[PDB]
Design a protein around this nucleic acid. Structure first.
Ligand code: MG
Ligand code: MG
Ligand code: MG
Ligand code: MG
Ligand code: MG
Ligand code: MG
Ligand code: MG
Ligand code: MG
Ligand code: MG
Ligand code: MG
Ligand code: MG
Ligand code: MG
Ligand code: ZN
Ligand code: ZN
Lengths: 136, 25, 99, 97, 212, 80, 103, 91
RNA sequence: CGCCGCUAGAGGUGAAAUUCUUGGACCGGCGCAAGACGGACCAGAGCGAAAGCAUUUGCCAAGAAUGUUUUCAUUAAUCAAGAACGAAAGUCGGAGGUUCGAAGACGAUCAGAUACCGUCGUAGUUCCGACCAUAAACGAUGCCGACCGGCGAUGCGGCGGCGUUAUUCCCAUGACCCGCCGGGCAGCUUCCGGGAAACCAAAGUCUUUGGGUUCCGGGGGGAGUAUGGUUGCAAAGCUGAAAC
C-alpha cells in the first residue's frame, strides 16, 4: 500500500479510544471523522483466562496488536480519548488503561494530546446497590 | 429476637386472632 | 386552522385524515391529538392520536383547536341496570351480552 | 453514651441533608456524614509520562489532569484503609498534616 | 480480507480565519453499487482543538467542525460547535468559590440559531483573610442578567464571521470581566459550550465565499 | 471589681441603644440646608419617607434601612 | 403592577366614605348626561354593548375612562357593599385624588 | 340537622350498590348539581343541561364545559398552553 | 429505536454461570423520542413550627432579623378539651412506566440458602386529587424569662474607620481590610459550679432545696398483650389492664 500520506515528519493523526472497565479493556483506533474504525483489539481476545482480562498484561498485549495493524495502514500518530463506565458506576479508569498508554508509546505510534472523556451525569439515576448497598 | 421482629410477630399473631373473632362473631 | 400554521405542541381535536374529508380523527368527548414534528418540505405532520400511534398525515387539513368538551365523562359508575339500559337504548341494540 | 458531640455527621442547623450515593458499596450516605476526598490524579502515572514526554510531537506542552470527586461511605472507608482509628483525646483533633 | 485497501482517503480543508486550512485525513469507500461516495461525507464531525489552528491561543477550548460537502479529494467543512475539555472545566473549580451559569437561545443575523453557555467564578480579592468569598445570590441574579445582556447583543445582530471570531480570543468573555467588576470581581470566565440547533439552507455559494 | 454608676462615655456609646443607663436613642435631627430658594429643613436622620421640601420640590433623603443619605450638595448639622 | 392596584382599592376606600359617588348603570347614565361625573370605572365582565356605550358617552362629555382590572363581583367588594356592581361614577371626590393621579 | 352522618347525597340509593361505589359517586353527584358562579352574568345560576353543556339563567348564555364539573384539569392546562403558544413571537 | 463503521466475543463476579451474540453483541458515529432527577459549586453555610427544602427566569402571597424621638396601652406566658401541618412505607381511583427494584423465577456459593453474590423482573418509585398519623420524627436534652468567664471566627442587617480598588472623576454604592452593636447556627478553652460518671455555659444559680407553666416515669417480665369503647376503606392508630 502507498497508504494515505507520505513525506512524514508531519504525522497522520488518529484517535485511540480506550475503555477500561474493571474487568475488560478496549483499544479502538479511529480517525478524526469518528465513524471509520481502523482496529478494535480488546483485552478479551489476548487473554485466554477470564479474570486477567483487565490486567496491564491484558492491555499491553492489546496495545501491541493495534499498533501493529496501524503500522501496516500507514497512519502514524494517535490522539487519546479515555474513559470508564460513567453512568452510575465508577469513574476511575481501570488498572489497564493507564498501562496501554505505555505500550502504545513503545511500539511506534507517536502521541498527540490526551483528553479525559468520561461522561459525568447530572441527574444520577439510581445505582444498583439498593438501600444498604453492597454487602461483603 | 429483636424487639422489631418481636413487634412483627405480635402483629402477625393478633391479625389472625382478629380474623378468628370476626369469623365466628 | 391547518396544522402547518400551528406550532408543534398544539393540542387540537377533530383533525382530518387526508385533507378535504371534513373532520374524522379525535372527535369523541374528551380526546385530543397533538401536532408534533413538522416536515417543512414534503408537507406532512406527525400527530399523536388518542391511542398513541403517531400517524403522519398530509398538512393541508384543519383542526379545531382545543379538547372536545365532555372530558372525563366515563368517571361516573353507571351503577344500575336501567342507566346502563338507557345509554344504549338511544344508540342501537348492542346491549345483549349473553355469554 | 455519646461517642461524639457531632454524632458523626455535620447537620447542625438543618433537619435533612440529601444522601450521596457511595462509590464502592453504593449505600446512600448523607454527605455531611460521608468520608470525602478530592484527588488530582495525573492521567498517566509519572513513571510512564517520561515515555510520553519523549514520544510526543509537542515540546511537553501536553500535560492534562484527571479530577475525580471521589466519594466514600464510612463502612467502606476503613474497609479500604483511609480513616484509621484514633484515641479518646485524638477524636477531638482536626486537619491532617 | 483488508477492506482498508478498498477505502479511499480524503483530506479535510478547514474553514478560513483560524490560521491554517488543513486538519487531517479520513477514510471512505469511494463508491460501489447503489451507494454514492458523498453519502457519508456530509455528516462526519471533527472535534479538534486550538494551538495548532491559531498560532498559540489557549490549547483547550475545542471546536466541533462537521464535514460539509464534496470537492475533488478536498472535502470541506463548516462551523457546528465549540466545546471545552472535561479537565479544564473541572479545573479552576475550588470548594470556596461560586459557579454562575448563563445560557441563551439566540438567532444570528442570518438563519443560524445557536445556544452558547457561559461560566464564571467569583474571585478571591487580594488582601484577604475571610476565606468564604461568596456572592449574595441577588448579585448572582444580577450577573446572569449581565451575561444574558451581552450574549444577546453581541450575537443577535451579528454574523458567524463576527461571532466565531469572538470565540477565538474570547472577546465576549473578556468584556464581561471588564464591565462587571462593579458588581463582584470574577475569575477565569469562559463561554464553556456553544451548540447549534437550526440550519435553514445549504448555501454552498455562502460556503465557498467563506473560504475564498 | 467593676463600676456601674460611673462608666466610661467611651464604653456606653459602644453598648447598645437601650442597654446603657439612660437609654437615649441614637438618631439625630439634621439640618438639611438645600440651596433651593430659602428654606432650612429639619429632617430626621433615620427617615422613612422621601423628604421632599416644599420650595425646591425635589428629593432630600433616600429611604434606606438604617439611616437616610443625602442627594447632592446638602449640608447639615445637629440641633441641640 | 401590584402597587398600582392596591392603591386603587385604597382610592376606592376614600370616595366610599367622604366623596360623593353613584352606584350602578342607570344612575351613571343620568350623571354622565349631566356632565356631573368625573371618573367612570368599568368592571371587566360587563357586556360589550354596555361597555362601549359608556365609552361613547365618555368621549362626548370628555369624562375620564378607567377600566378596573377585575370582575364585577370584587368591584362590589372594592366599593365596599356586598352586592355586585359593574359601573360606578365619582360625582364629587372631595379629598380623593383618583381624578388627579392617572389623569 | 346532621341527619345522615356519612353518606350525604347518596342517601337516595340507600342500602345497595356497594360501599366504594357510593363513595365514588358522592364526589360527582355534588359536582354536577351545584350552582356554579358564572363568569359572565355574575350570578350563580350556572346549571348544567345534558352532559357537557352548562347554562346560566340570567343572560342565558350557554357554555360547553366539563362533563360533570364545570372545568377540567385538561381545560385549564390547554388554555394555559394555547395562549402561551400564541404569544410565542407571532404564532 | 433508526441507520455508518469495525469485529469475535460482551456484561458478570474472590472466582464462574444464567443472560446478549456472524441474524452483528459490545465498542466508535450522527441524530431522534421517553421519563426520573438537578451532579461537581455543597460548608461542622442559610431558611423553615416540625416532617423538610438545590438549574435558570417569571408569578403569587408570607416571614425572621435590622433600623425606628411611629403606634394602641397590657392586649402576656404555658396549655385539659378541640384543630391544622406530619419523611419514607402502604390504601384508593386518574396519567405514564427511564433507572432502581419487595415479592416472583432463575445461576452460583455452601452440608443446607428459600441468604449475602449474579441475571430477568411485578407492586412500588413519578406526577394528580382522597386516605392513613407512625420513626433512632434525636439536642435521644419541654417552651418563655432573669443572671453567671473568655477568645477566635462566621451568616444576615445597622453605624463608624479622608488605607486601596471599579463607572468618568467629586457624586453615590460595589469589592476587601481593622472594628463596635444586635439577634443566629456552631466552636475552642476554663476547677463559675454542677455531674454516679461520660460530660455540661447549660445537664450551672439544689439539703445554702420555692421564676412561671404543660406533658409524663416509679424493679425487670408478662405487654401497648387480652378485653372494652373510639377512629381508619383497609393496613393499623389513640386510650389500656389483670392473673401469674
Ligand atoms: Mg360485559
Ligand atoms: Mg352475561
Ligand atoms: Mg454505656
Ligand atoms: Mg432527621
Ligand atoms: Mg439471540
Ligand atoms: Mg390559656
Ligand atoms: Mg410521600
Ligand atoms: Mg379500591
Ligand atoms: Mg378505574
Ligand atoms: Mg433489571
Ligand atoms: Mg455585615
Ligand atoms: Mg409544653
Ligand atoms: Zn461503601
Ligand atoms: Zn351568566
Amino acid at each position: 500500500s502507498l497508504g494515505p500520506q507520505v513525506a512524514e515528519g508531519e504525522n497522520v493523526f488518529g484517535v485511540c479510544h480506550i475503555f477500561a472497565s474493571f474487568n475488560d479493556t478496549f483499544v479502538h483506533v479511529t480517525d478524526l471523522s469518528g465513524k471509520e474504525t481502523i482496529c478494535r483489539v480488546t483485552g478479551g481476545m489476548k487473554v485466554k483466562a477470564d479474570r486477567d482480562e483487565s490486567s496491564p498484561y491484558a492491555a499491553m498485549l492489546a496495545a501491541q496488536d493495534v499498533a501493529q495493524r496501524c503500522k501496516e495502514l500507514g497512519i502514524t500518530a494517535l490522539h487519546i480519548k479515555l474513559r470508564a463506565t460513567g453512568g452510575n458506576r465508577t469513574k476511575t479508569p481501570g488498572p489497564g488503561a493507564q498501562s496501554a498508554l505505555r505500550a502504545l508509546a513503545r511500539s511506534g505510534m507517536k502521541i498527540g494530546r490526551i483528553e479525559d472523556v468520561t461522561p459525568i451525569p447530572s441527574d444520577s439515576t439510581r445505582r444498583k446497590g439498593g438501600r444498604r448497598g453492597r454487602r461483603l | 429476637m429483636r424487639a422489631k421482629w418481636r413487634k412483627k410477630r405480635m402483629r402477625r399473631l393478633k391479625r389472625k386472632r382478629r380474623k378468628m373473632r370476626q369469623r365466628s362473631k | 386552522l391547518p396544522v402547518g400554521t400551528m406550532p408543534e405542541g398544539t393540542i387540537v381535536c377533530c383533525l382530518e385524515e387526508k385533507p378535504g374529508d371534513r373532520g374524522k380523527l379525535a372527535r369523541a368527548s374528551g380526546n385530543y391529538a397533538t401536532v408534533i414534528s413538522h416536515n417543512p418540505e414534503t408537507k406532512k405532520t406527525r400527530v399523536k392520536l388518542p391511542s398513541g400511534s403517531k400517524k403522519v398525515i398530509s398538512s393541508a387539513n384543519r383542526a379545531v383547536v382545543g379538547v372536545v368538551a365532555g372530558g372525563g365523562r366515563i368517571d361516573k359508575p353507571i351503577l344500575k341496570a336501567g342507566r346502563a339500559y338507557h345509554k344504549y337504548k338511544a344508540k342501537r341494540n348492542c346491549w345483549p351480552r349473553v355469554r | 453514651t455519646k461517642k461524639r458531640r457531632n454524632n458523626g455527621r455535620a447537620k447542625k442547623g438543618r433537619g435533612h441533608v440529601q444522601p450521596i450515593r457511595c462509590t464502592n458499596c453504593a449505600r446512600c450516605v448523607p454527605k455531611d456524614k460521608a468520608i470525602k476526598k478530592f484527588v488530582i490524579r495525573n492521567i498517566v502515572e509519572a513513571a510512564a509520562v517520561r515515555d510520553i514526554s519523549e514520544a510526543s510531537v509537542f515540546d511537553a506542552y501536553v500535560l492534562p489532569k484527571l479530577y475525580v470527586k471521589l466519594h466514600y461511605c464510612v463502612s467502606c472507608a476503613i474497609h479500604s484503609k483511609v480513616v484509621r482509628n484514633r484515641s479518646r483525646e485524638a477524636r477531638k483533633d482536626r486537619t491532617p498534616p | 480480507v483488508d477492506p482498508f485497501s478498498k477505502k479511499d482517503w480524503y483530506d479535510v480543508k478547514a474553514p478560513a480565519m483560524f490560521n491554517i486550512r488543513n486538519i487531517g485525513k479520513t477514510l471512505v469507500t469511494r463508491t460501489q453499487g447503489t451507494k454514492i461516495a458523498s453519502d457519508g461525507l456530509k455528516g462526519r464531525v471533527f472535534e479538534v482543538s486550538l494551538a495548532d489552528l491559531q498560532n498559540d491561543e489557549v490549547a483547550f477550548r475545542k471546536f466541533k467542525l462537521i464535514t460539509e460537502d464534496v470537492q475533488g479529494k478536498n472535502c470541506l467543512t463548516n462551523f457546528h460547535g465549540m466545546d471545552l475539555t472535561r479537565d479544564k472545566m473541572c479545573s479552576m473549580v475550588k470548594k470556596w468559590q461560586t459557579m454562575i451559569e448563563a445560557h441563551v437561545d439566540v438567532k444570528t443575523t442570518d438563519g443560524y440559531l445557536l445556544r452558547l453557555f457561559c461560566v464564571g467564578f467569583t474571585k478571591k480579592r487580594n488582601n484577604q483573610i475571610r476565606k468564604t468569598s461568596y456572592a449574595q445570590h441577588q448579585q448572582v441574579r444580577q450577573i446572569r442578567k449581565k451575561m444574558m445582556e451581552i450574549m444577546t447583543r453581541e450575537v443577535q445582530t451579528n454574523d458567524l464571521k463576527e461571532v466565531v471570531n469572538k470565540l477565538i480570543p474570547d472577546s465576549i468573555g473578556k468584556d464581561i470581566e471588564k464591565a462587571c467588576q462593579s458588581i463582584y470581581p470574577l475569575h477565569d470566565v469562559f463561554v464553556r459550550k456553544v451548540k447549534m440547533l437550526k440550519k435553514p439552507k445549504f448555501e454552498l455559494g455562502k460556503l465557498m465565499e467563506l473560504h475564498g | 471589681a467593676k463600676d456601674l454608676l460611673h462608666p466610661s462615655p467611651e464604653e456606653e456609646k459602644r453598648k447598645h441603644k437601650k442597654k446603657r443607663l439612660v437609654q437615649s436613642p441614637n438618631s439625630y435631627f439634621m439640618d438639611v440646608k438645600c440651596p433651593g430658594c430659602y428654606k432650612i429643613t429639619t429632617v430626621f436622620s433615620h427617615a422613612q419617607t422621601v423628604v421632599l421640601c416644599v420650595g425646591c420640590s425635589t428629593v432630600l433623603c433616600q429611604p434606606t434601612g438604617g439611616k437616610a443619605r443625602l442627594t447632592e450638595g446638602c449640608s447639615f448639622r445637629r440641633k441641640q | 403592577t401590584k402597587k398600582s392596584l392596591e392603591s386603587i382599592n385604597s382610592r376606592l376606600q376614600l370616595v366610599m366614605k367622604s366623596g360623593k359617588y353613584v352606584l350602578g348603570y342607570k344612575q351613571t347614565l343620568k350623571m354622565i348626561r349631566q356632565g356631573k361625573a368625573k371618573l367612570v370605572i368599568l368592571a371587566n365582565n360587563c357586556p360589550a354593548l354596555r361597555k362601549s356605550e359608556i365609552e361613547y358617552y365618555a368621549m362626548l362629555a370628555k369624562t375620564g375612562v378607567h377600566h378596573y382590572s377585575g370582575n364585577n363581583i370584587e368591584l362590589g367588594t372594592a366599593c365596599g357593599k356586598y352586592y355586585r356592581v359593574c359601573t360606578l361614577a365619582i360625582i364629587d371626590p372631595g379629598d380623593s385624588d383618583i381624578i388627579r393621579s392617572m389623569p | 340537622a346532621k341527619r345522615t352522618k356519612k353518606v350525604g347525597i347518596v342517601g337516595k340509593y340507600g342500602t345497595r350498590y356497594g360501599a366504594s361505589l357510593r363513595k365514588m359517586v358522592k364526589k360527582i353527584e355534588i359536582s354536577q348539581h351545584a350552582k356554579y358562579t358564572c363568569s359572565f352574568c355574575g350570578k350563580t345560576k350556572m346549571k348544567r343541561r345534558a352532559v357537557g353543556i352548562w347554562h346560566c339563567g340570567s343572560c342565558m348564555k350557554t357554555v360547553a364545559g366539563g362533563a360533570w364539573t364545570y372545568n377540567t384539569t385538561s381545560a385549564v392546562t390547554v388554555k394555559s398552553a394555547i395562549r402561551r403558544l400564541k404569544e410565542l413571537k407571532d404564532q
